[PDB]
Amino acid sequence: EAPRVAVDPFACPMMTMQRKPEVHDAFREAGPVVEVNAPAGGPAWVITDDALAREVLADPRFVKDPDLAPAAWRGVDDGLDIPVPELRPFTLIAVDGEAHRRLRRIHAPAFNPRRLAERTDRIAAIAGRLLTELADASGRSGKPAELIGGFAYHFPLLVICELLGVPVTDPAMAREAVSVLKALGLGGPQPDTSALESLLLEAVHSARRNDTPTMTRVLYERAQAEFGSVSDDQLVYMITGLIFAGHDTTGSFLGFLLAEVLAGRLAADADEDAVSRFVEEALRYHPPVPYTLWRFAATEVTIGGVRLPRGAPVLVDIEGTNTDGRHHDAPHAFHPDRPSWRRLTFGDGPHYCIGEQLAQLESRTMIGVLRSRFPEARLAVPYDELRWCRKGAQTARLTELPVWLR
Numbered sequence: 001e002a003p004r005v006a007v008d009p010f011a012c013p014m015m016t017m018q019r020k021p022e023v024h025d026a027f028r029e030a031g032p033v034v035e036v037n038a039p040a041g042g043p044a045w046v047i048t049d050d051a052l053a054r055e056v057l058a059d060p061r062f063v064k065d066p067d068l069a070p071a072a073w074r075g076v077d078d079g080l081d082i083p084v085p086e087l088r089p090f091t092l093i094a095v096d097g098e099a100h101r102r103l104r105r106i107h108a109p110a111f112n113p114r115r116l117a118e119r120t121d122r123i124a125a126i127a128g129r130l131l132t133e134l135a136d137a138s139g140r141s142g143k144p145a146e147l148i149g150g151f152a153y154h155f156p157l158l159v160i161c162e163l164l165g166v167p168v169t170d171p172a173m174a175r176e177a178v179s180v181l182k183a184l185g186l187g188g189p190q191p192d193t194s195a196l197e198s199l200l201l202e203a204v205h206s207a208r209r210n211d212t213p214t215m216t217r218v219l220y221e222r223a224q225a226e227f228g229s230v231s232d233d234q235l236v237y238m239i240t241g242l243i244f245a246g247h248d249t250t251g252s253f254l255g256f257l258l259a260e261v262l263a264g265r266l267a268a269d270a271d272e273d274a275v276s277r278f279v280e281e282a283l284r285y286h287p288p289v290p291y292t293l294w295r296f297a298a299t300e301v302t303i304g305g306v307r308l309p310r311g312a313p314v315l316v317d318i319e320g321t322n323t324d325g326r327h328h329d330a331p332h333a334f335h336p337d338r339p340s341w342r343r344l345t346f347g348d349g350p351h352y353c354i355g356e357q358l359a360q361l362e363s364r365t366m367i368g369v370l371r372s373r374f375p376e377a378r379l380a381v382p383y384d385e386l387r388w389c390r391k392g393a394q395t396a397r398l399t400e401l402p403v404w405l406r
């Protein structure tokens, strides 16, 4: 029924900064709704048109329910987010309908942007200490600071950990361990995570004992109210998820944002408005997540002219719609003064990113620190020699970002 392009939608060779994988253009040329080959077997359908994508992502017939995914995917697709049944109610990405609204209710007050903003000075301090350490190591060594491994994931990880009351001192070890717990929680096979698990449980114990209106306290109070009774293990599971959600995507994006700033594309006298417009363009141009998470048709659906069967796995093309010439003049150029137009980098519909305000705050705070404390920071290699890639369902990321910070 649909036009068919017989390729894996996740195919990604090593890319330059300015280019996006060829599959996006081949899908868009085929039609608004394109059959493709799902990586773990059978068909999948990609949505290549912005307006249609917005309709799909708000249509209750397309659901996250991982039980609708083909049998062949279980244990293999790894892009499939499939908690054990009893943990799906605690997993924002695994539910829709009333169960999803409940979790949105629990998370909303915890991400109150007024409360995040009170943390700006701490966020700056975090970034500034990480950068001073990196500059000092480069002074001693004679080697450029490598900001992907030394900054991009560490900075957002330390922010979200501190917001949740989880006192991490080694972000590299924490990043590895929360990755393991994420994979286990979302249904992967099967390594030592006990140190991190101790800190997560300590943050939950502390949330229950103390009335201080922090993030984890508010999650606790609101989950207790909605579920009647919530266990320490359930809260640990929920905060594990927000640690991973809060750092991986953000850290992938920040590597790209850093590259564009350090390439000298931000005006030297840029005011706050110009900075936030620069961040906005970077979110259009370098989305870390190329497709929405899997949705499945709950019934037979005809959409954009095409008949999709019950069970049909559907992807919205974020990277391709963000760089569609039908809505963006010179879609593959980086133009921060471009008129502001919508993008799909944070999703749409009920499952829209709950972290967007935080990710923005972190972005603009990082640039402030850089501009004020490392005004001469530059790339240690040309912008045209930077490369990025992604395998499978992982976020897009630079291979490295070598910088002379001062």
Ligand code: HEM
Binding pocket: 092, 093, 094, 160, 242, 243, 245, 246, 247, 249, 250, 253, 288, 289, 291, 292, 293, 294, 344, 345, 346, 347, 348, 350, 351, 352, 353, 354, 355, 356, 358, 359
């Ligand atoms: C630039 C950084 C980030 C980007 C690009 C990003 C992108 C996205 C996208 C595309 C989705 C929706 C997925 C879908 O519905 O298919 C989403 C959801 C989500 N994000 Fe973000 N995100 C970012 C930062 C953050 C941060 C800082 C947090 C904090 C914990 C967060 C937590 C979440 C959560 C929990 C969801 C699930 C919402 C739902 O299913 O209801 N994210 N993100």
Ligand SMILES: CC[C@]1(O)Cc2c(O)c3c(c(O)c2[C@@H](O[C@H]2C[C@H](N)[C@H](O)[C@H](C)O2)C1)C(=O)c1c(OC)cccc1C3=O
Binding pocket: 078, 079, 080, 081, 090, 091, 092, 093, 181, 182, 183, 184, 185, 186, 237, 238, 240, 241, 242, 244, 245, 248, 249, 289, 293, 393, 394, 395
């Ligand atoms: C793009 C936004 C995002 O999907 C949000 C998100 C998320 O909301 C949750 C968790 C996440 O891991 C993620 C992220 O998802 C991963 C896995 C996906 N297959 C895909 O590879 C994507 C790029 O990364 C990011 C959790 O891992 C999780 C959890 O893990 C055990 C426990 C409770 C809730 C969540 C929970 O809500």
